[PDB]
Design a protein around this ligand. Sequence first.
Ligand SMILES: Nc1nccc(-c2csc(N)n2)n1
Ligand SMILES: [Cl-]
Length: 446
Amino acid sequence: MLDKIVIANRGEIALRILRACKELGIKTVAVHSSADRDLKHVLLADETVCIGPAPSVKSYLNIPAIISAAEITGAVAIHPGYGFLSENANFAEQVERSGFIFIGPKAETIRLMGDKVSAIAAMKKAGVPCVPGSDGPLGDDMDKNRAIAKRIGYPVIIKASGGGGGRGMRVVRGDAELAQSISMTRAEAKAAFSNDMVYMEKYLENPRHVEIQVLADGQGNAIYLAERDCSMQRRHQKVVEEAPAPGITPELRRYIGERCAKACVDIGYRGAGTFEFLFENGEFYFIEMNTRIQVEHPVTEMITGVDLIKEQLRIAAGQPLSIKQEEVHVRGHAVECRINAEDPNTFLPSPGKITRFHAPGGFGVRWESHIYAGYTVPPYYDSMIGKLICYGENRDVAIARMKNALQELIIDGIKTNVDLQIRIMNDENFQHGGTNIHYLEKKLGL
Ligand SMILES: Nc1nccc(-c2csc(N)n2)n1
Ligand SMILES: [Cl-]
């Protein structure tokens, strides 16, 4: 087992990783900004290193500082969590060059998945279903671009190759808007990523977001751990996630899961990963792969019994997966509600000091959060302050328990989205299940 690791993150996920480390007897190094000295995981960590001031550029994105913390403490590995540097291939490369273990895939694999065009080519080659598209980057020949659009059939969508998470895309419904849509997407990608490559896909009108969890070890084993529906979104940001996805049969699960595991073998994948699909009219279409552990991982843990963070750590140590595919069984149902410190009218972050706090408890109730009474939510980081996950023997019980747990949750002193989450749990269409990626914004009239 790894002797000591740097937790290169903050907030709830840093605490999540710390718990897993403690269970495995792994010593912890909590690197933190000057604004995060009183983070719960920092207070629980074996060693702490202040890596810079509050702004993330000088702390959680500061590659030299993080690697230096690993060096000075005698750590052997770095867990990047999610966000920050977790999808930064150059960071992974530098970590390995510096002689530490990066808890994730090989840097080349991170780079492959960060290039959406290259990622799609790889998945298509491996037999994973993808969205009908350009199968390559678009050039500047608008005669050619119109021909590609005609072959796919309007409506289409232009996407940045160096992008992700539904950001910076534009839908095109006819030739008259194609040139400008391509140009603008290109320009925005260049300004954001210094990478102006774009591609084209068929635009699906009302898909659901269904993603497959995988794990692959360095012994050649690769397994899938069912799926999650993450269709409840605002501005492409997930709000509620659940597992399994309503309406997905064991046969469909097996079909798509096997193709994802096969792809992992083909590309030499290692660690946790997520294959994101659009699901419409009973069909899956791959859009992108995330190589990190994700925010919504706990719903998969609840329904499979597999501790995904511990598996990440085992894999990085050179241990084989603790479970085989035939030992993975979907049991029950889990829902996750993200808890955000946000204004209910503007949806802007709402930082400040928590004056009273009380967490829900009970059978099937799992609360993932670093917050506590008297804790100050800083303005410098993401609005998500916790995650409430409820498990039941079926979907209805999971929803019932979430309703009850949301009512017990007290977070005073700052504005949160608890009341919105209560509204979503009471939504008749959510209760029926299978709502699409546009539903929440439609409900809210946004
Ligand atoms: N191709 C297609 N059609 C509809 C929606 C999307 C989409 C939404 S967010 C994302 N990454 N892709 N992609
Ligand atoms: Cl994530």
